[PDB]
Amino acid sequence: SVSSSLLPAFGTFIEDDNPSSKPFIVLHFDRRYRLWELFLVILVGYSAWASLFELAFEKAAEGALLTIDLVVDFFFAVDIILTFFVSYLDNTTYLNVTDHKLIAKRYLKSVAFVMDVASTLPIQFIYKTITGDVGRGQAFGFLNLLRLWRLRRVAELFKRLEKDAHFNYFVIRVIKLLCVTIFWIHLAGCILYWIAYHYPRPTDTWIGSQVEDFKERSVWLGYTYSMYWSIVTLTTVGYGDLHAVNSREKTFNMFYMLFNIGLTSYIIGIMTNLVVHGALRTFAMRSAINDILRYTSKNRLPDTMREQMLAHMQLKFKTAELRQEEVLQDLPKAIRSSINQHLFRSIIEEAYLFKGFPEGLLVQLVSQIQAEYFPPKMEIILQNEIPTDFYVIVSGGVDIIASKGVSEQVLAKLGPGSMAGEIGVVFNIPQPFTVRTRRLSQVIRIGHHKFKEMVQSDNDVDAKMIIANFMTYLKG
Amino acid sequence: SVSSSLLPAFGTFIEDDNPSSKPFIVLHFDRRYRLWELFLVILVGYSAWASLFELAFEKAAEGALLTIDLVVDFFFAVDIILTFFVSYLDNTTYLNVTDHKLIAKRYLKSVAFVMDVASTLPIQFIYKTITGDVGRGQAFGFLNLLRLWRLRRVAELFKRLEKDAHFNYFVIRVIKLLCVTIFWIHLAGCILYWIAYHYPRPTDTWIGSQVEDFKERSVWLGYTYSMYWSIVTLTTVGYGDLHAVNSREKTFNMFYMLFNIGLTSYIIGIMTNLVVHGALRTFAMRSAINDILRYTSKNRLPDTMREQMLAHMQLKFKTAELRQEEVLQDLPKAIRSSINQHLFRSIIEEAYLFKGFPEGLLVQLVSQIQAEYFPPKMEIILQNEIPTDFYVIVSGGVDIIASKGVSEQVLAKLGPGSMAGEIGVVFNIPQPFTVRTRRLSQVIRIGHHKFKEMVQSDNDVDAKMIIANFMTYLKG
Amino acid sequence: DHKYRIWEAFLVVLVVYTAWVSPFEFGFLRKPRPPLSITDNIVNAFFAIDIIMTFFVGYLDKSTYLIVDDRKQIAFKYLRSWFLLDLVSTIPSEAAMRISSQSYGLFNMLRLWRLRRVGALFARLEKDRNFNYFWVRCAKLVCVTLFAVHCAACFYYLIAARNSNPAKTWIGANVANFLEESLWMRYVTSMYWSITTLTTVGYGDLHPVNTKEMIFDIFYMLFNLGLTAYLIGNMTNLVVHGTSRTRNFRDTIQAASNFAHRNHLPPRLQDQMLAHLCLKYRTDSEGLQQQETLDALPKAIRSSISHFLFYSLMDKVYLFRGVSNDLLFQLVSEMKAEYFPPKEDVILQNEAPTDFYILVNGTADLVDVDTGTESIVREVKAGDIIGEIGVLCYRPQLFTVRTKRLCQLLRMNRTTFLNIIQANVGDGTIIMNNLLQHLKEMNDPVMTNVLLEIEN
Amino acid sequence: DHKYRIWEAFLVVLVVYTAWVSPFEFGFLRKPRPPLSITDNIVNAFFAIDIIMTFFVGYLDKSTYLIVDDRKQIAFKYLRSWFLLDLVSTIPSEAAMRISSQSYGLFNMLRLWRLRRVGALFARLEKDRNFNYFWVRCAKLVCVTLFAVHCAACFYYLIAARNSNPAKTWIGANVANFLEESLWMRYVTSMYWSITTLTTVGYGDLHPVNTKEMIFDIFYMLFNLGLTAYLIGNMTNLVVHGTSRTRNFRDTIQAASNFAHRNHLPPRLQDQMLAHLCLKYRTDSEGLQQQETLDALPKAIRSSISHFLFYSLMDKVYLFRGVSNDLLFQLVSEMKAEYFPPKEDVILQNEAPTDFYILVNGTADLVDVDTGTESIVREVKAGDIIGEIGVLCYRPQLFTVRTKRLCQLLRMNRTTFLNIIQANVGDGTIIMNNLLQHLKEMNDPVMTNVLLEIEN
Ligand SMILES: [K+]
Ligand SMILES: [K+]
Ligand SMILES: [K+]
């Protein structure tokens, strides 16, 4: 109910369930609340570019950007009002708290509240209303770095997409390698241009020694040069087109080039892992094919003999696959019993020995049974051996054989519902026949030591009706 | 004796009575012959340098190099006369041929003879022995590339060093990365200068525009420049110091840069394989050890229990490693039989059940016995289960427990030479005791049906004397 | 011990100072100067005091004793290990200046012998568990790279300066007057060149001019070709061995979903399976999925662990009046702990009683699902047993249990209980008497107690 | 089928011709010229012939039937998939040029749609066994890289050439007059720049000047950052899958040496182990290589292996003269094969005989171990059986057999032979008579019957 709906990454539809609480409360896994955080994540992509772009390129702060920086901020203001009507899921008790008084105290005692209220205040707009219309000082403008707190939402979204199985894993872990590098390039370029702008001598800079007056020109002309330099310095191509001349920027260039080893040495460590781990199953199966095909050529065996060997191996991988699809091992008994009763109760009752049996023992006879799976044409019970157990057929055919050093078909085919090896276990005699499979089937094993005491433990024993049913079946 | 002696990389001493055929032959797995090949491999190092150095830097062909080039060729001329007295190992049979008329016919029918004769022939000295003083012609000098056929000796030597277990694998496959790169660099550096030398206009060449007269100068001053350019172009550092100016050398530069991705992408593919495949055991062991620590620390259990818990698992890895030391599985019967005779024959006889037993059947019985390994304080035979096996105690010790309530040590001081599980298998009765080990030990597994049929098949069977020994043991 | 650790960790701070000062003084200076000729004597004093205090030492070994005190025995080992080299790097340079004027340079590079103490600290600390393995490789690699860069820069500037004719050098061809500038302006250009060459971003200024620098650069450009390829293998190793859990989660969910779809289970029967499956990954450390990490141990260990967990709790129970030590011990060391998600049934109506439960933590409410009504008549806290009368009387369970919290319980089947009772019946007589002595109440169960006494 | 394959195999080289020609004509030319405008007509005629001849053959669907031949379905399959695109890119460029001269450049870039055919040859060749898996990735990577380089060079030169004021471009600043040189000289500089940039060796000449080339370069320098990192995974994934044999061999040899050293085997018994191991690991080309994993097959299939390898040889033997052949059907089916190194002993003197062997290849020597001498009186060739009389009379073995080549032997256990003789006693008289009457060399019947006739 609760853990079933938190698995998907985009919520679930809600219709008249018990955690409705007050009619003015919205749940935190609803679908309408999961199409509202995506909008904020999309708008986060615009509010990280603008702050850095306005840190350096002064006199661009007046224009349409002044209006957009308020139109965007209005929504992040509304979200703070909204966050008081949202339930949260407790950790000690997996019940989800849905009380207004309990959720109002959870938020006011967290640093997230103060950071959210700090990262939404208009600094430049308010300052010019009271003080002069233009703010300056070579320092006033570092408050534009407050709006870099809103990257936690993207970091959070990129954790709800990996856990889901409806989505790829080569496509989602490679789109997370574009944003990081593009942001890195943006930051480096803007910082370098800012360093160059505020210098005493304008003809002793990296741009002032090529273009005489980089100031009093267009903004985008200064933007293209400082993106070009950053993208050339990354990726380790170097022309002599543009380089550093001062001593304030040689140090920044050194520190920028020293940190770039660990990122280009990290992209490879992921693009190698993806390719290595995507190419194993084909390797194994092709190894099997190459191993088999080498035997059938050098010895010049006919075509049918090779064909049968190649057709027989395919079923073995299928048996392994179905053997690797079992997950109910260590769940509590109250669920294993229900699953077993739903899957296997019908066929146990229709057994020739298990007829007229007390209903008390059948309940715990249905439990602690583990299903099996076998490829066709394989031995399960041999001849002249100590009995150990017996099997019950479920969904396949089987054959019965009895010979010393050869094979002689006896009796006939056995469909679902039949037993196997029941004759020897009751008389404590070595098994008098041999049984081999015919097709891909599943069987249920019981055992002998358990069954020795299981029958004796009960108080409802009939007048050896076990013997009566056994003799009725054996007579034919 | 056939393949055992060829395993070491540097041969083996020869004492006497070997397949010598002493008159006029030397054995090809000898030790003194294996030190006459390393000498020629060392001499190949010098002869793969002067051959390329004389192609480009003409006027160096006259001097001491001319004398050394003949002194070295003397030995490679002697080797061809030597190689008629060597023995070879066949393929269809694994005998080594020691008849002259058979080894003589093999050599003349291959390309090795003609190629060796062609390579070991001086051609520069003779073709100006009387014709003229010195040779030229812009093509006479490509004849010097015939002496590059001697690299197969190094190629063969590096294959015999990786098959030995006395030598590393992280040091032999890393000295194989220096030689290839150094040879590649030398070849490119010589070819480029050769292209530069024979050009009409000397001022339109890569070196001619930096030094006005690169000719009429020392050869070493023209060698350093062309080595520096090659090492700069490789490793992908590029200054604008020296570049191409013509159209005859832009093309060579293009191909040289295209053929280098496959090598700089191949060094990484080996240095990332050595590191990965050298660090697995520590990872697994650390996973187990830190798996233990996290659970015990959080549950606040004292250090006393964790001291034993940590030490217990250490023996598990030792048992697994000792299990992995077994390799003889598919060898013919005549080898496993003899090994079992040397290892297991004495202890089988000294058993109370097996005393006076016919020796003709002990040989059949002392074979096909596969042992096992058990960590300390384990269980092998429980109480009240169907009989399948009995055991034999080679080493270690086991204890018998039979009290469900207040379990204790009674009637249990079993040591090397005792037996367990005898009573249950011999009486066809469910096992009446449980036996537990004490330390790391090795035991023998026999079976039930096989031991039943073995005595029945024989005619001269000890009749009830086995029963006599059994009653003597069981009475007390 | 404790007093020795503090003093031992002190000298590892001065080794960095020595390793930074010595190449700089070798390359950029010629004669001693006051600001840097003061701390050197202090460092020599500290190291000399370390030298004299090395004979009152004890060492540990697998074969040798933990503490060995025979003083004359230690001397034969110590004097034959590093006694000759540990003394040469302590004489003040001013004392040795009178030997030769040109020897001031080569005498300042012998202090790098004290750098061994960092090599005996990055291997001693390797074999420890309280510190992560992620932060024992990066520090070493970073230190190696920084040392290489610094040394190369200093040597290159020395080669440039020692030559005559200041023009026609890698620095004089770019700066008109490079010998008339501050010592901290010549030190930035050299490191600029060194980091430009090591990362293979060749700009084009500050390149060699004559043959000696060409040879030096040829030898310096081959070391990096290996130093760079030895840094990608480690990163790939680290990345591949750090992203295992999430793929396990995805694979397990995929397998469970595929199996459930294959057998066409009813829609309501997958929710319990999924909730239980995810609850183990939530409590990955509390013992549900950790059981096999705990179930690989012998009998004694896992029999003694339950002592610290449930022994005291099992004493104060409804039943088990006064059994001294044995029945309680055997019953305690046979249970099986299980976690249950909130709001899940554990006992239904008339469903073939097989076992009973003991509740350790959490809360639950006894529920009587009658015809059309669901009562909350009883509520149980930690300690009480659920499902007892239905297993000692072979009668179907009276009520149902639904939890309201993440609860941890205990289990034991009837067959083991009966076998234990049959093994020792004398202590068994107390249990049935306890039930009759405790069914003395004025509420409704008296009507069924009459039936019990009819069948008891 | 033979005729069909050749035609499409012919129609893949023309695709390469188009993929080279079309971008070059787009970039470096503006008006048709004879030498490069004639083969276009030929290739267009060939592709038109291909287009018209597509309804004379039927598609094949495996699931629907073994083979499908139809009329209506082919029309719908061809019409609704790629008919329009294939039809439109066939009109001669001369015909449509009269619409406008500017269309002649952009029109020729539509012929790249025919590049899907290479996408088929690299999908049909992947699922095959006659071609390795290593020569199907390198070619793809090489082709992709070369195509990228060529396209980038052509587009960059086009951007350069379309400009006015021929100076202030990436090429005008380097050569004063670039429009007055040969057409094959302007095509080398562009490729020089392209491969200089793609391999990240930036020399410094031929760099962008104005903003359009800066933007193009910014966009071109990001694609390589992924294309280069994609080529190292495919090389590590190749190096790892190529060095598995040698490591296994070294591990096995080391393990065997550890075993022998731990149990202290005698020097003359380790040689047989280290000889058989080497023989097995160098006999991996044929024989007992797959039989380690060929034992997982059912008995029905494995029973047919012996029929085509030993049944014909089993017919003509010393024994088994005349039989119903029912016995042989099981005797051959219960046989095992082994290999022996040259100069190895298989049978010693008087050591409780248990088996008898059949010789298939090679030679063997029968040697009597007399008092101090070893004679070579009897030599056996392939075909005969050794040890028959000693195992059918409960007598110790007569002589010792030593091999002299690389042999191959068949083995049967005496217990199974006794079991099969007991199962069919009637046919045993034939075997007994065959043993009795065939002793036909000097001294042989009497030495065999020294006690047999007494005990017969
Ligand atoms: K580079
Ligand atoms: K570069
Ligand atoms: K450059």
Side-chain angles (χ1 to χ4, degrees), chain C residues 34-60 63 68 70-96:
Chain C
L36 283 178
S37 75
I38 295 166
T39 74
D40 270 337
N41 291 326
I42 307 173
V43 176
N44 296 115
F46 283 113
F47 275 86
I49 283 173
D50 168 79
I51 297 169
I52 62 170
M53 192 285 258
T54 192
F55 305 112
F56 310 142
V57 65
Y59 57 95
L60 285 74
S63 56
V68 173
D70 204 341
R71 294 177 181 175
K72 313 153 281 283
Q73 185 75 27
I74 310 176
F76 188 73
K77 175 179 281 189
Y78 188 73
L79 266 68
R80 191 36 197 158
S81 54
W82 45 76
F83 195 87
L84 194 49
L85 294 174
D86 208 286
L87 182 69
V88 296
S89 70
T90 199
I91 297 89
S93 66
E94 288 166 350

Side-chain angles (χ1 to χ4, degrees), chain A residues 162 164 167 233 238 265 269 330 332, chain C residues 202-203 235 239 250 259 276 291:
Chain A
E162 291 190 6
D164 197 323
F167 302 121
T233 293
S265 169
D330 310 296
Chain C
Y203 272 120
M235 180 70 67
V239 165
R250 308 178 43 109
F259 160 76
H276 280 68
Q291 65 183 357

